[PDB]
Each structure stands twice: as C-alpha cells, then as structure tokens.
Amino acid sequence: MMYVKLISSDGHEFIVKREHALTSGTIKAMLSNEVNFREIPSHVLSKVCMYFTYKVRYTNSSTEIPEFPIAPEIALELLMAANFLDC
Amino acid sequence: MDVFLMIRRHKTTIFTDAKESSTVFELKRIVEGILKRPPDEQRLYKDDQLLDDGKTLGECGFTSQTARPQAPATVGLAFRADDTFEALCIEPFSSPPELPDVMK
Amino acid sequence: VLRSVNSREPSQVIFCNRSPRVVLPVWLNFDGEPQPYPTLPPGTGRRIHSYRGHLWLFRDAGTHDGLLVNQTELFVPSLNVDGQPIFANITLPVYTLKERCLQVVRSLVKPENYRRLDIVRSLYEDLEDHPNVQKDLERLT
Ligand SMILES: CC(=O)NC1(C(=O)N[C@H](C(=O)N2C[C@H](O)C[C@H]2C(=O)NCc2ccc(-c3scnc3C)cc2)C(C)(C)C)CC1
C-alpha cells in the first residue's frame, strides 16, 4: 500500500494512505512522498487526517452517516486549513 | 469488522485500519512495511499495557464502535535500539489558542 | 420550472429522520414556491399523506443546512404497491470539511461579528452566504 507523509508546523509526522491524501487537490499538486505545512499545527492536521478517513469510509455508502465532530477551540484554524487544501 | 487506529511513537503518527479479528503481531507486520523495523524490534501498547502478539485487537479492546473513522483509537509504539527497548514516549499534539471573544 | 404536478392521485409516505438534526420538510407548490411543513425531531418518523408527482426536499430547521433523502436532493412520491407506503429516508450528507467548519463557526458567532474574525475576506463572504432554499432552487434549475 502506498503511504505519504504530511508534516505539521511543529514537526509532527502524519503517515496516511496516498489515496486518502488525494482528497485534497492542493496536496496532489504539492506531491505531483513528503509534504511540509508551515502554517498548519498538529492539533489541526490530525483532524484533517481524520476527515480523510471519514470521507473515504462514508462516501457512496448505505450505512447511516454520523456527524463529523469539531471542537469549538479548533474550528477557526480548521476552517482556514480546509480553505487552503480545498477539501 | 474494521477498526480505525492511530499508531503513535514520539512525533510519528500512522493512520490505518485493521480487522477486529486480526492479531497484535499482524499489526506489527503493518508497521514493518511502513517504518522498516521488524516485529521483534517493536512493542505495542494500549495505554500503559503491553500487548501480546497472539491476541486479537478485539480481545485487547479495539472494537468497531469505539475505534471509529472520525475518532480513531490510539496504539502506542516503542522501538528497540541495540540490546534494550526504549520507554514508551508519545509527544502530545499542540494546544489550541484561547477562543476569540466573539466565539464566547 | 421546478414545481409539483397537480395529479390528485393519493400517495402515502413515511418521512424517516435518520439524521441528528431537527428536520424541516419543504413542499414545492404548483407555482414553485417553497412551503414549509411541521418539523421532525432527530431519529423520529411520521406517516403523511401526499400525492404522485409532488416534489419535496429536506433541511435542518434551525440553520437550513442541506440534507439528503434516499441519497439525493429531491423526493417525489410514487405509486404505492400492495398498499405499502413509500419510505423517505432522510440523512446527513458527507459535507466537505470547509462546509462543516462554516456550520460550526456560524453556530458560535453572531452574524454581526463575522467581520471581527481574523480571516481572509473571501471566508467572511462564505460565512455570510448561509444556506437558503431559494438559492438552491435557482441552482437545481
Ligand atoms: C384539496 C386539494 O387541493 N387536494 C389535492 C392537493 O394537492 N392537496 C395539497 C395537499 O394536501 N398536500 C400537498 C403535499 O402533497 C402534502 C399534502 C398535505 O398537505 N398533506 C397533509 C400533511 C400534513 C402534515 C404533514 C406533516 S410533515 C411533518 N409532519 C407532518 C404532520 C404532512 C402532510 C394542498 C394543496 C391542500 C396543500 C389536489 C389533491
């Protein structure tokens, strides 16, 4: 299986499936196997990775869909990341 | 049934899934393909508890309704350098700032 | 363009709310005006009387966020076979991460304060441009 490494501004290294990371057109362009994000800290990028897993699992599925949870304290930063990543 | 995991050591975090019926040892083979260290140089943990190779992830408390895609369960990881194993160390994620006033 | 047909052929329907939101059903009348109907609490169901060729869509009653019905945007009652009703299963879509972040930020900040947020102008416009049925009717056309 092909994995890629996404690195947060504080040096946390997140290893995810390549297919999952291609959810983002921005990440695809940065690849085309490691990407550094200078403006995205780990408490945000970890959530981004969890969104990829959630999306791939529940897209085109029958089983009832649960809400994607976002704590108030990270919502503003997560919004800015999602805008940059187009996801 | 699929379980969704974060496998964590120091500042490394791997997102992956596995079967509830799969074994601890089989999860080490997954880590081996990604980080290039064999099973005999790996220890896996749930919180502070060392996991035995022969046990299933289900037996050890990773079940499909607690290890969810949007909220995966954590498995700790320690490597052996030379003769002995390092202690389990997982660096915490960064802290969010204060909520702005207009969000209170 | 998008409007119910006046067929007068009865059709019984179960509205089943399999979402965690409060649900607003909306009937598109014979001139295409949206007409709101009583809400459904999370997890609950109602047996209602509608007609063949009538158009319905479903929204979050508090925010107007978009919801799906049998995996799509619009629901049209069909012919009942053997007296059994048609099921309208109402669910959350998989929202984009951006739209979900906008939902959460909208639920915490009063509209007058969107401009005090420290973000690019385009995201302030994205917040202000909140979900709305008329907007989506124009899109669907
Ligand atoms: C008299 C007449 O015009 N009959 C016809 C018709 O189309 N009637 C419409 C009608 O009865 N409709 C339109 C929609 O198909 C639904 C249906 C109606 O109003 N059914 C009653 C009803 C009441 C409550 C609810 C709901 S929705 C959530 N909770 C409830 C209880 C659903 C349906 C209406 C023009 C009177 C609004 C021509 C066949």
> Which residues of B fall within a CB distance of 8 Å from C118?
100
Q: What angle do CA B100, B101, B102 make, to 5 degrees?
A: 95
* Domain limits for position A77: 1-87
Report which residue type is found at A13: E
Indicate which technique resolved this structure. Answer: X-ray
| Tokens, residue C85 | 């009703």
Number of folded domains in chain C? 2
Looking at the complex, report in whole angstroms how far the Cα of residue B97 sits from the nearest Cα belonging to chain C: 13
Report the CATH number that the domain containing residue C55 is assigned in CATH: 2.60.40.780
Q: Does A79 touch chain C (CB under 8 A)?
A: yes
DSSP assignment, residue B93? Answer: P
Sequence length of chain B is: 104
Domain B1-104 in CATH 3.10.20.90? The answer is yes
> What are the C-alpha distances in Å from A8 to residues B14, B29, B35, C32, C42?
14, 26, 19, 50, 38
Q: What atom of ligand 1 comes closest to residue C50's alpha carbon?
A: 15
* Domain limits for position C129: 92-141
Report which residue type is found at A68: F
Resolution limit, Å: 2.3
Nearest CA to C60 out of C29, C84, C91, C35 is that of C91
Tell whether C71 and C105 lie within a shared domain: no
Nearest CA to A14 out of A39, A30, A38, A34 is that of A34
d(CA C82, ligand 1 centre) in Å:
22
Tell whether C45 and C65 lie within a shared domain: yes
Number of folded domains in chain A? 1
Tell whether C107 and C137 lie within a shared domain: yes
CB B93 within 8 A of CB A14: no
Report which residue type is found at C101: C
d(CA C49, ligand 1 centre) in Å:
6
Tell whether C77 and C18 lie within a shared domain: yes
Q: What angle do CA B3, A22, A27 make, to 5 degrees?
A: 120
Tell whether C72 and C96 lie within a shared domain: no
Which of C13, C17, C48 is the pocket-test mutation for ligand 1 (most atoms within 8 Å of CB)?
C48
Nearest CA to B7 out of B26, B25, B30, B23 is that of B30
Of residues B4, B13, B96, nearest to A74 (C-beta) = B96
Residue extents of the structural domains in chain B: 1-104
Nearest CA to C28 out of C90, C60, C73 is that of C73
Tell whether C80 and C96 lie within a shared domain: no
Report the CATH number that the domain containing residue A25 is assigned in CATH: 3.30.710.10
> Which residues of C fall within a CB distance of 8 Å from A75?
101, 104-105, 108
Calpha distance C120→B20 (Å, rounded): 44
Looking at the complex, report in whole angstroms how far the Cα of residue A12 sits from the nearest Cα belonging to chain C: 21
CB C43 within 8 A of CB C4: no
Report which residue type is found at A54: Y
How many other C-beta atoms are found inside a 10 Å radius of the C-beta of residue B95?
9
Per-position DSSP letters for B35-64, written without gaps between them = H---GGGEEEEETTEEPPTTSBTTTTT--T
Tell whether C17 and C85 lie within a shared domain: yes
